[PDB]
Amino acid sequence: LQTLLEVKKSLVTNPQEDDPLRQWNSDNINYCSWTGVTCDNTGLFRVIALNLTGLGLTGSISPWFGRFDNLIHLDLSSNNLVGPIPTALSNLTSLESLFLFSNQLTGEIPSQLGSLVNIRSLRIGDNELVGDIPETLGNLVNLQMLALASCRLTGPIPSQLGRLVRVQSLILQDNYLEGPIPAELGNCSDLTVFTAAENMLNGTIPAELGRLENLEILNLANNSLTGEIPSQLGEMSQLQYLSLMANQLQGLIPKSLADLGNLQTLDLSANNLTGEIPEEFWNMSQLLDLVLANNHLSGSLPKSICSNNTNLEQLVLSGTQLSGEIPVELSKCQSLKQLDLSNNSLAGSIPEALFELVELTDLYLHNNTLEGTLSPSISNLTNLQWLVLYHNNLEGKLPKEISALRKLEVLFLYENRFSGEIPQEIGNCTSLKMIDMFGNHFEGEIPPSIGRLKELNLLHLRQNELVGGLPASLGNCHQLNILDLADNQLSGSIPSSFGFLKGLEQLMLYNNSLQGNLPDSLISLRNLTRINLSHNRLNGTIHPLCGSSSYLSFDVTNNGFEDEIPLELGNSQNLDRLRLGKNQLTGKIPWTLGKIRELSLLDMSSNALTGTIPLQLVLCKKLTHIDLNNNFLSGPIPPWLGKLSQLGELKLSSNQFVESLPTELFNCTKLLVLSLDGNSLNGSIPQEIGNLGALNVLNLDKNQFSGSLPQAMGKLSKLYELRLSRNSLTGEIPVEIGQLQDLQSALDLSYNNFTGDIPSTIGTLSKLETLDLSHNQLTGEVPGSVGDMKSLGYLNVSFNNLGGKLKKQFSRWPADSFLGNTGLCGSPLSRCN
Amino acid sequence: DYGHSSPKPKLVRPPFKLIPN
Numbered sequence A: 001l002q003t004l005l006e007v008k009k010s011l012v013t014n015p016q017e018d019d020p021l022r023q024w025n026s027d028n029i030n031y032c033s034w035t036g037v038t039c040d041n042t043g044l045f046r047v048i049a050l051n052l053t054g055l056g057l058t059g060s061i062s063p064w065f066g067r068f069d070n071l072i073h074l075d076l077s078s079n080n081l082v083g084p085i086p087t088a089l090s091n092l093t094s095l096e097s098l099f100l101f102s103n104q105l106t107g108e109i110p111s112q113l114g115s116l117v118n119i120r121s122l123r124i125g126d127n128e129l130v131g132d133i134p135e136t137l138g139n140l141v142n143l144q145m146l147a148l149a150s151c152r153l154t155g156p157i158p159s160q161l162g163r164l165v166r167v168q169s170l171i172l173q174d175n176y177l178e179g180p181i182p183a184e185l186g187n188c189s190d191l192t193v194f195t196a197a198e199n200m201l202n203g204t205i206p207a208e209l210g211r212l213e214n215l216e217i218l219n220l221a222n223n224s225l226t227g228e229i230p231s232q233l234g235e236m237s238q239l240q241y242l243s244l245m246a247n248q249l250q251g252l253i254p255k256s257l258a259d260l261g262n263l264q265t266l267d268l269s270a271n272n273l274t275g276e277i278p279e280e281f282w283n284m285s286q287l288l289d290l291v292l293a294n295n296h297l298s299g300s301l302p303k304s305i306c307s308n309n310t311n312l313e314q315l316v317l318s319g320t321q322l323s324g325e326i327p328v329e330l331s332k333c334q335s336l337k338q339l340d341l342s343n344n345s346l347a348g349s350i351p352e353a354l355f356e357l358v359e360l361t362d363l364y365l366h367n368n369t370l371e372g373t374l375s376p377s378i379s380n381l382t383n384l385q386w387l388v389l390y391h392n393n394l395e396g397k398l399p400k401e402i403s404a405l406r407k408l409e410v411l412f413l414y415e416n417r418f419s420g421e422i423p424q425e426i427g428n429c430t431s432l433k434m435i436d437m438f439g440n441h442f443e444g445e446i447p448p449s450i451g452r453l454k455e456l457n458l459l460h461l462r463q464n465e466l467v468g469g470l471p472a473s474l475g476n477c478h479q480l481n482i483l484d485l486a487d488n489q490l491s492g493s494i495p496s497s498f499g500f501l502k503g504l505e506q507l508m509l510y511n512n513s514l515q516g517n518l519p520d521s522l523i524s525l526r527n528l529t530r531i532n533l534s535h536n537r538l539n540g541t542i543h544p545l546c547g548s549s550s551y552l553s554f555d556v557t558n559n560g561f562e563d564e565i566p567l568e569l570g571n572s573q574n575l576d577r578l579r580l581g582k583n584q585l586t587g588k589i590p591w592t593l594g595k596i597r598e599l600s601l602l603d604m605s606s607n608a609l610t611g612t613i614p615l616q617l618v619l620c621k622k623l624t625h626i627d628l629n630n631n632f633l634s635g636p637i638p639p640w641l642g643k644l645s646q647l648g649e650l651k652l653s654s655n656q657f658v659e660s661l662p663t664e665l666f667n668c669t670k671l672l673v674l675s676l677d678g679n680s681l682n683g684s685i686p687q688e689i690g691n692l693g694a695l696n697v698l699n700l701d702k703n704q705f706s707g708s709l710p711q712a713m714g715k716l717s718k719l720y721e722l723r724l725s726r727n728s729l730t731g732e733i734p735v736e737i738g739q740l741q742d743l744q745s746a747l748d749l750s751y752n753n754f755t756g757d758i759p760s761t762i763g764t765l766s767k768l769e770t771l772d773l774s775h776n777q778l779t780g781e782v783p784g785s786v787g788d789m790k791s792l793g794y795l796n797v798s799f800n801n802l803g804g805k806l807k808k809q810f811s812r813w814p815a816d817s818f819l820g821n822t823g824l825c826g827s828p829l830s831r832c833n
Numbered sequence B: 001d002y003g004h005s006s007p008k009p010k011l012v013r014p015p016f017k018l019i020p021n
C-alpha cells in the first residue's frame, strides 16, 4: 500500500521532469533507501518519518499523506509549497510531529486536526493561512509546541485553548488576531514562552496570567491592549523577558515587577503609563535592559538609582518627561553599555562620575536643558560609538581627549554653545561616519586631520565661526553623502581634490568668502542632488557643476560666475528650484529647461542674459515664480506665459522687452505680483487685466504705455501696490478706482499725461500711505478728501494745471506737495491775490 | 518569513540636524 502512496504524491509535490525526489521511481523499488524517507527500525518496513525540508519543492500537499497510519514525524518545512492543508491528515492518528512551516500554504487550519490527540509538536506558520484559529486545538493535550506565527490568521485566541496543559511554547505573533486575551490560559501551567506580539489584541491583560509559575518569556508587544498592568504578573517568578511595548496601557507602573528576580529585560515603552519609576527597580540586580521611553511618566532620577543594578546593560528613559539633574549615583551601574536620557527636561551639568561608566558604547543626552562643559574624561569611555548631545546648552571648548575614542562612529553636538577650535587630532577617531556640530560657536580652521576619516559619510559644520581654507585633505573622505560648511567665514578656493567625492549628494557652502574658479574636477560629482554655493565670491564658469543629472535644487545666487548658462542643466528632470541670480552669466536662457517637468521656481535676475524667453519653458507647467529682472532680454512678452496656470509672481523688470501686453497673460489667475517696469513696452493696457483677481502688486513704471486706463482695473480688490509712473497714459482717472480698498504701499501715477479732475473717490482709499500724481496735466481743484486721507503719509501733486484756494484740509502738507501749479493758492502756499 | 520571538530592545537612532537645502 504505502510504496504506491509514496510515489503518488511525488506526482503532486513535483509536477515536473526534474525530481529532487529522483530516487522515487519504481526502478529502485526499496523505498526505505530513498532520499528523505525513514522506515521502521523493526523489520516490518512501513514509513515512520519523512523529512523533505530545504529541497526547494514548489508543488502541493495531498490527501494521500493521510494514508500512512504509521507516520510519526512529517516534515515538509522550508520549501515553497502551495495550496491548502488537507483535512485528510485527520486519519494519521499516530502522528507526533507535524512541520509545514515556511511554505506558501493557503486556506484555513482544518477543524479535524483536533482528532490528532497524540500529537506533540505542531508548526505550520510562515505561511499565508487565512482562517480563524479552530477551537478544536484544545483537544491536543499532549502538545508541547504550537507555532501559528507569521501568517494571516484572524479572530480571538480560542479560550477553550487553556486545555493544552502541557504546552511549553505558544507562538502566535505576526498575525491579525483580535479581541481580549483569555483568562483560561492560566491553566496552561507548563507554559514557558508565550508570544502574541504584532497582532490586534484589544482587551486588557488578564490578571489570571500570574498563575503560570514556569513562564520564562512573555511578549505582547505591538498590540492595542488597554488598562493597567496587573500587579499579579510579579508572581511569574521564573520570567526573564517581558515586553509590552507599543500598546495603549495606562496607569502607574506596578511596583511588584521588582519581585521577578530572574528578569533580564523589561520593556514597557510606547504606552500611556504614568507616575514615577518605582524605586524598587533600582534594586533589581539581575536586570539587563530597562526601557520605559515614550510614556507620560513623571518625576526625576532618585539618588537610590543603581543601588543594586550590578548587571544592567541598557537603560532607556527618553521621552519620559524626566526632570532634575543627572544623579552621580548613576555611575554605580558600572556594567552599563547604553544610556538614553534624551528628549527629557534634565538640567545641570553632566556629572564627572558618569565617565566612570567605562563599558558605554552609546550615550544619549540630547534634547534636554543640560549646561556645563564636556569633560576631557570622555576618553575613559574608550568603547563609545554614538555620542549624542544636541539641543542642550553645553558650552566651552571641546576636549582634545575626544581623539582617544578610536571606536567612535557618530558625534552629534549640534545646537549647543561650544566654542574654540575643533581638535586638530579629531582625525584619530577613524571609525567616524557622521559629524554634526551645527549651530555652535566653533572658531579657527577646519582640521586637515579630518581627511583621515575614510568612513565619514556626513560632515556638517554649518552656522559656526570657522575661518581659513577648505582643507584639500577632505577630498580623501570618499564616502561623503552630505558636506555642509555653510554659514561660516571660510576663504580661498574650492580645492580640486573635491572632485574625488564621487558619491556626494549634497554640497552646501553658501554664506562664506570662497573665491576663484571652480575646479574642472567637479564634473566628476555626477550624483549631486542639492547644491547651494550662494553668497560667495566664486568666479569662472558653472559648467563643472552640471556633470550631474538628478538635481533637485541648484542655487548659486550672488556670486561672480561668468559666461553662458549650461544647457546641461536640462539634464535634471527633477530640478524643483533653479537660482542663478546676481551673477555675471551671459547668452540666452537655455531652451532645455523645458525638459525640467518639475521646475517651480526660476531665478536668473541680475545677470547679463540676452535674447528672449524660450518657448520650450511653456513645458514647465509647475512654475510659480519667474524672476528675470535686470537682464538684457528682448522682444515681446511671450503669450505662452498664460499657459503657466500656476504662475504667481512674474518679474521681468529692467530688461529691454519691446511691444504690447498680450491678452493671453491674464489667464494666469493665480498671479500676485506682475512687475514689468523699466522695459520699453508700448501700446495700451488691456481690459482683461481685471482677470487677475488675486493680484497684489502691479508695477508698470518706466515703460512707454499709451492710451486711457481701463475701467476693469477696479476688479483687483486685493491689490496693495499700484505703480504706472513714467508712462504716457492719456485719459482721465476713473471713478472705478475707488474700489481698490486694499491699496497701501503706493498709488503712483506720476510723469504721465493724465487730464481732468482728480476723482473725489480717491479719498476713499482708507489704507493708502503714499499718493503721487506729479508731472501730469490734471485740472480743477483737489477734492479735500485727498488731504484728510486717514493713512496718507506722502502727497505730491506738483507740476499739474490745478487751481483755486486749497480746501483747508491741506494744512501741514508742505508747499513742495503742490509745486509748479500756477494759479493754485491756499494754506501752504501764497495768499490768493 | 519568521521574526524573532523575543528580540533584544534596540535603541532608536536620532537624526542629524538639517532643514536648509
Ligand SMILES: *[C@@H]1O[C@H](CO)[C@@H](O[C@@H]2O[C@H](CO)[C@@H](O)[C@H](O)[C@H]2NC(C)=O)[C@H](O)[C@H]1NC(C)=O
Residues within 6 Å of the ligand: A178, A179, A180, A202, A203
Ligand atoms: C474589541 O474587538 C471586538 C471585535 O472587533 C469588538 O467587538 C465588537 O463589538 C461591537 C459592539 O461594540 C459588536 O457589534 C460586534 O459584533 C463585536 N464584534 C466585531 C467582530 O466587531 C469590541 O468592541 C472591541 N473592543 C474595544 C474596546 O475596542
Ligand SMILES: *[C@@H]1O[C@H](CO)[C@@H](O[C@@H]2O[C@H](CO)[C@@H](O)[C@H](O)[C@H]2NC(C)=O)[C@H](O)[C@H]1NC(C)=O
Residues within 6 Å of the ligand: A319, A343, A344, A367, A391
Ligand atoms: C524634544 O522632545 C520633546 C518631547 O519628546 C518633543 O516634543 C514632542 O515630541 C513628540 C514626539 O516624541 C511629539 O509627538 C509631540 O507633538 C512633541 N510636542 C509635545 C508638546 O509633546 C520635541 O519635538 C523634541 N525636540 C527636538 C528638537 O528633538
Ligand SMILES: *[C@@H]1O[C@H](CO)[C@@H](O[C@@H]2O[C@H](CO)[C@@H](O)[C@H](O)[C@H]2NC(C)=O)[C@H](O)[C@H]1NC(C)=O
Residues within 6 Å of the ligand: A318, A319, A340, A342, A343, A364, A367, B012, B013, B014, B015
Ligand atoms: C527624540 O525625539 C525626536 C523628535 O521627537 C525623535 O526623532 C525622530 O527619530 C526618527 C528615527 O531616527 C526619525 O525618523 C524622525 O525623522 C525623527 N524626527 C521626528 C520629528 O520624528 C526621536 O525618535 C526621539 N528619541 C530619540 C532617542 O532620539
Ligand SMILES: *[C@@H]1O[C@H](CO)[C@@H](O)[C@H](O)[C@H]1NC(C)=O
Residues within 6 Å of the ligand: A051, A052, A053, A073, A074, A075, A097, A099
Ligand atoms: C529534518 O532534517 C533537518 C536537517 O536537514 C533537521 O533539522 C530536522 O530536525 C529534521 N527533522 C524534523 C522532524 O524536523
Ligand SMILES: *[C@@H]1O[C@H](CO)[C@@H](O)[C@H](O)[C@H]1NC(C)=O
Residues within 6 Å of the ligand: A184, A186, A187
Ligand atoms: C482552570 O481555570 C479555572 C479558571 O477559573 C480555574 O477555576 C480552574 O481551577 C482551572 N482548572 C483546574 C483543574 O484547576
Ligand SMILES: *[C@@H]1O[C@H](CO)[C@@H](O)[C@H](O)[C@H]1NC(C)=O
Residues within 6 Å of the ligand: A197, A198, A219, A221, A222, A243, A245, A246, B006, B007
Ligand atoms: C515592534 O514594532 C517594531 C516597529 O514596527 C518592530 O521593529 C519590532 O520588531 C516589533 N516587535 C518587537 C518585539 O519589538
Ligand SMILES: *[C@@H]1O[C@H](CO)[C@@H](O)[C@H](O)[C@H]1NC(C)=O
Residues within 6 Å of the ligand: A261, A283, A284, A285, A286, A307, A308
Ligand atoms: C542585590 O540583589 C541580589 C538579588 O539576588 C542579592 O543577591 C544581593 O545581595 C543584593 N545586593 C544588595 C546590596 O542589595
Ligand SMILES: *[C@@H]1O[C@H](CO)[C@@H](O)[C@H](O)[C@H]1NC(C)=O
Residues within 6 Å of the ligand: A352, A353, A354, A355, A356, A377, A380
Ligand atoms: C578617567 O580617567 C582619568 C585618568 O586619565 C582619571 O583621572 C579620572 O578619574 C577618570 N574618570 C573619572 C570620572 O574620574
Ligand SMILES: *[C@@H]1O[C@H](CO)[C@@H](O)[C@H](O)[C@H]1NC(C)=O
Residues within 6 Å of the ligand: A403, A404, A425, A428
Ligand atoms: C593620535 O594620532 C597620532 C598619530 O598616530 C599619535 O601621535 C597620537 O598619540 C594619537 N593619540 C592622541 C591622543 O593624540
Ligand SMILES: *[C@@H]1O[C@H](CO)[C@@H](O)[C@H](O)[C@H]1NC(C)=O
Residues within 6 Å of the ligand: A502, A503, A504, A527
Ligand atoms: C550614485 O548613486 C547610485 C544610486 O544611489 C549608486 O548606485 C551609485 O553607486 C552612486 N555612485 C557613486 C559614484 O557613489
Ligand SMILES: *[C@@H]1O[C@H](CO)[C@@H](O)[C@H](O)[C@H]1NC(C)=O
Residues within 6 Å of the ligand: A511, A535
Ligand atoms: C547670509 O544669509 C542670509 C540669509 O537670510 C542673507 O540675508 C545674507 O545676505 C547672507 N550673507 C551674509 C553676509 O549674511
Ligand SMILES: *[C@@H]1O[C@H](CO)[C@@H](O)[C@H](O)[C@H]1NC(C)=O
Residues within 6 Å of the ligand: A515, A516, A517, A539, A540, A560, A562
Ligand atoms: C577670479 O578670482 C580670482 C581670485 O584671485 C582673480 O585673480 C581673477 O582675476 C578673477 N577673475 C574674474 C574674471 O573676476
Ligand SMILES: *[C@@H]1O[C@H](CO)[C@@H](O)[C@H](O)[C@H]1NC(C)=O
Residues within 6 Å of the ligand: A658, A659, A660, A682, A683
Ligand atoms: C510699438 O507699438 C506699435 C503700435 O502701438 C507697433 O506697431 C510697433 O511695432 C511697436 N514697436 C516699435 C518698435 O515701434
Ligand SMILES: *[C@@H]1O[C@H](CO)[C@@H](O)[C@H](O)[C@H]1NC(C)=O
Residues within 6 Å of the ligand: A752, A753, A777
Ligand atoms: C505729456 O507730458 C510731457 C511732459 O514732459 C509733455 O512734454 C507732453 O507735451 C505731454 N503730452 C501731451 C499730449 O500733453
Ligand SMILES: *[C@@H]1O[C@H](CO)[C@@H](O)[C@H](O)[C@H]1NC(C)=O
Residues within 6 Å of the ligand: A774, A775, A795, A796, A797, A798, A799, A814, A816, A817, A819
Ligand atoms: C514733489 O515733487 C517735486 C518734483 O516733482 C519735488 O521737487 C518736491 O520736493 C516734492 N515734494 C515733496 C514733499 O516730496
